[PDB]
Design a protein around this ligand. Structure first.
Ligand SMILES: [Ca+2]
Ligand SMILES: [Ca+2]
Ligand SMILES: [Ca+2]
Ligand code: NA
Length: 466
């Protein structure tokens, strides 16, 4: 009985609905009756053209603000180069108006969309914190297609205020259910960047989203890491189609590309999911993604089955998001038990790294204590170490059930001699596994050079339930 969008460009939105069965299965969600009605999504970016013919109808002033110029109007700053068209393109992916004879449609075409202009100026910690913490009780989902530089040699993340904003968000946002933070995993593929060296994507508070090309391949810009949760389609080579969305100056574009286009699609699917079940917490949402994401159709050389039988890849997380499955599972979902946190400091003495270091430790996962965990969610390996050439290192973490998470792959451009200072490498690959047993940390020098350094701290942090 459901009638799909009549928008002129909808047929070109191959990733939403297609006969080729290689899409995000969004029409199946719309058919079940979910279009994002009642949900509020905010695009933290370079502004939003609120008067765009395909956005005005869903624009929400309450989900918007201009942090760069300190005013409530997020209108982009126009320039000959159209530098500030990025936020508008991301906004259209999430909630472009449907059946209005203009461009295409958003994943959640009935959702309310707002924008925070915060990238067009000095992006300070305060600027970030005010954006992430904007109207936490009105906005449900925050989408961010930006982050630290992808030169493949930086290690950076949120400063204190932004961290506090994230924490306040998941704790108090949405009436205590927790703000949903969707993050683009990065465009550093050509520089061999790792998204675990990015504190925003690496955070347990954000759903880090990677990309897949139309033909199901790992895009050139893609960054691999264990913190990524799932994937949505984006651009690839010139024989592959790209993302169709709203563009600056009230135009329509069929060339929105890179990691930037994936997070918004995920944000849209999550909006449909919240409509299906408004009581889902920030953790419930991550559980739904893990359970419903599909690897099939995605090519990668590292697909591996984890301890609970799910396929995972460092390029895709658990695979492609499936909107129909997301909204279906959401309706019947029982809120997960309170989050427990088990801290296990592993080292009893510093360890020389040399050419290779292996640290084994059998843990009980806080057995007999209030934070005993039998069903893992995120896991962090907080490492502090010195090394002469950081990029030559490759670090792996093996769970008791045999799941190998590569916390850090070699980064050829990273010649830093600063090592890691209590950096929290995170992995989503052992989700739902029993964490008790022997964990193994492996640090190896991937180069032939005679490198040297010392691992002075290894703290294993487990999050989960019993
Ligand atoms: Ca303004
Ligand atoms: Ca439209
Ligand atoms: Ca990066
Ligand atoms: Na994350």
């Amino acid at each position: 009985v459901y009638q799909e969008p009549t928008d002129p460009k909808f047929p070109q939105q191959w990733y939403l609905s297609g006969v080729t069965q290689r899409d995000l299965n969004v029409k199946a969600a719309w058919a079940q009756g979910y279009t994002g009605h009642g949900i509020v999504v905010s695009i933290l970016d370079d502004g939003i053209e609120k008067n765009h013919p395909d956005l005005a109808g869903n624009y929400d002033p309450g989900a918007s603000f201009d942090v760069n110029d300190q005013d409530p109007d997020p209108q982009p700053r126009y320039t000959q180069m159209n530098d500030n068209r990025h936020g508008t393109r991301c906004a259209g992916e999430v909630a472009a108006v449907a059946n209005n004879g203009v461009c295409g449609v958003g994943v959640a075409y009935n959702a309310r969309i707002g924008g925070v202009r915060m990238l067009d100026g000095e992006v300070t910690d305060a600027v970030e914190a005010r954006s992430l913490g904007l109207n936490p009780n009105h906005i449900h989902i925050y989408s961010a297609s930006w982050g630290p530089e992808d030169d493949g040699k930086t290690v950076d993340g949120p400063a204190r205020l932004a961290e506090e904003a994230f924490f306040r968000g998941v704790s108090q946002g949405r009436g205590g259910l927790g703000s949903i933070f969707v993050w683009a995993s990065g465009n550093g593929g050509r520089e061999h960047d790792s998204c675990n060296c990015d504190g925003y994507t690496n955070s347990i508070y954000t759903l880090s989203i990677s990309s897949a090309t139309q033909f199901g391949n790992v895009p050139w810009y893609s960054e691999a890491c264990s913190s990524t949760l799932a994937t949505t389609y984006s651009s690839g080579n010139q024989n592959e189609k790209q993302i169709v969305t709203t563009d600056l100056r009230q135009k329509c574009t069929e060339s929105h590309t890179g990691t930037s286009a994936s997070a918004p699609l995920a944000a849209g699917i999550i909006a449909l999911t919240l409509e299906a079940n408004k009581n889902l917490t920030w953790r419930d949402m991550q559980h739904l993604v893990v359970q419903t994401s599909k690897p099939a159709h995605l090519n990668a050389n590292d697909w591996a089955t984890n301890g609970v039988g799910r396929k995972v890849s460092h390029s895709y997380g658990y695979g492609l998001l499936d909107a129909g499955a997301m909204v279906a599972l959401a309706q019947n979902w029982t809120t997960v038990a309170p989050q427990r946190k088990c801290i296990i400091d592993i080292l009893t003495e510093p360890k020389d790294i040399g050419k290779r270091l292996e640290v084994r430790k059998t843990v009980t996962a806080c057995l007999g204590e209030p934070n005993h965990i039998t069903r893992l969610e995120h896991a962090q390996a907080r490492l502090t170490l010195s090394y002469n050439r950081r990029g030559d290192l490759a670090i792996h973490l093996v769970s008791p059930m045999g799941t190998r998470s590569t916390l850090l792959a070699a980064r050829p451009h990273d010649y830093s001699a600063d090592g890691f200072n209590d950096w929290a490498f995170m992995t989503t690959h052992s989700w739902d596994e029993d964490p008790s047993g022997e964990w193994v940390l492996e640090i190896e020098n991937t180069s032939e050079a005679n490198n040297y350094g010392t691992l002075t701290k290894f703290t294993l942090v487990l999050y989960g339930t019993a």
